[PDB]
Amino acid sequence: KMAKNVDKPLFTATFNVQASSADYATFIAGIRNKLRNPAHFSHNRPVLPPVEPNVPPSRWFHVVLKASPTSAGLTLAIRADNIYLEGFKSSDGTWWELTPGLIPGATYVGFGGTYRDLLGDTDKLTNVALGRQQLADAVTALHGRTKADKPSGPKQQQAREAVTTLLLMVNEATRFQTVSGFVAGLLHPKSGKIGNEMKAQVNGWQDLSAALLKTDVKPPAKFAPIEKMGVRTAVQAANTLGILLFVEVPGGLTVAKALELFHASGGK
Ligand SMILES: Nc1ncnc2c1ncn2[C@@H]1O[C@H](COP(=O)(O)O)[C@@H](O)[C@H]1O
């Protein structure tokens, strides 16, 4: 059940930590546009293709974060089907994986990519500080990771804080316009923490995605509100979502069909 093609990304997206808000916003937009199922939209927002039924994960992209203009960057291995962070490459060339035995030749980092794993309690998410400095510190801490850092309690804690930072500023920002917008603001000519609404959105990507998709089924259908996210209408949901996870909703596309539409449309 090992992954395939981790070393053969579908695309590579690059960001310099010192760049402007504008550069960051289009970096995020670029990732969404390249991940989209060209044939499957919902309320003008892109929707991911389904996870392929019975193969191991074979669709990956890389994000490269450079702490400096010419410096080699930190490479993130992210799944193209569900935007999971599963690996990062260090300056010594070691692949660290976040799921034991998922990436050929990798070394397990010692924890996973859920906020439960990273923070102990998911409520701690609204105390994580985001900004340009945090981004630079997170990238440097993971780029400078050595194998000996794994048996160090405090090093493991710092690595978790660094991964948590990348997850919010890269993965969740891709998923959510609220998050990407929030981060772009911190990079304008610088520290912030997300509120409880963004925390609820980030913990409910599937639910919020599935709720938009339901409104698209052809009737024989209203939007179910999600109070804790602050999202009470289809339009607020469309404005909150950057890209939807594919969810098999009753009367909408099935996994099989959406996948054939993916292939027929020039998607890989
Ligand atoms: N490795 C990961 N990278 C990014 N997001 C993740 C990862 N693992 C879990 N998540 C997020 O957590 C949500 C729920 O995870 P789970 O409920 O444990 O299947 C997912 O839909 C993702 O938004």
Swiss-Prot record:
Catalytic residues as annotated in Swiss-Prot or TrEMBL: E172
GO molecular function: rRNA N-glycosylase activity; toxin activity
Similarity comment: Belongs to the ribosome-inactivating protein family. Type 1 RIP subfamily.
Protein name: Protein synthesis inhibitor I
Record bears the keyword Cytoplasm: yes
GO biological process, alphabetically ordered: defense response to fungus; killing of cells of another organism; negative regulation of translation
Compartment annotation: Cytoplasm
Keyword rRNA-binding included in the entry's annotation: no
Keywords: Acetylation, Antimicrobial, Cytoplasm, Fungicide, Hydrolase, Plant defense, Protein synthesis inhibitor, Toxin
PANTHER family assigned: PTHR33453, RRNA N-GLYCOSYLASE
UniProt cross-references to PROSITE patterns, sorted A to Z: SHIGA_RICIN
Miscellaneous notes: Three similar RIP 30 isoforms I, II, and III have been described in Barley.
Catalytic reaction list: Endohydrolysis of the N-glycosidic bond at one specific adenosine on the 28S rRNA
Organism classification: Eukaryota, Viridiplantae, Streptophyta, Embryophyta, Tracheophyta
Function (record text): Inhibits the elongation phase of protein synthesis. It inactivates fungal ribosomes even more effectively than mammalian ribosomes and is thought to function as a constitutive antifungal agent in plants.
SUPFAM superfamilies according to UniProt: Ribosome inactivating proteins (RIP) (SSF56371)
Species of provenance: Hordeum vulgare (Barley)
GO cellular component: cytoplasm
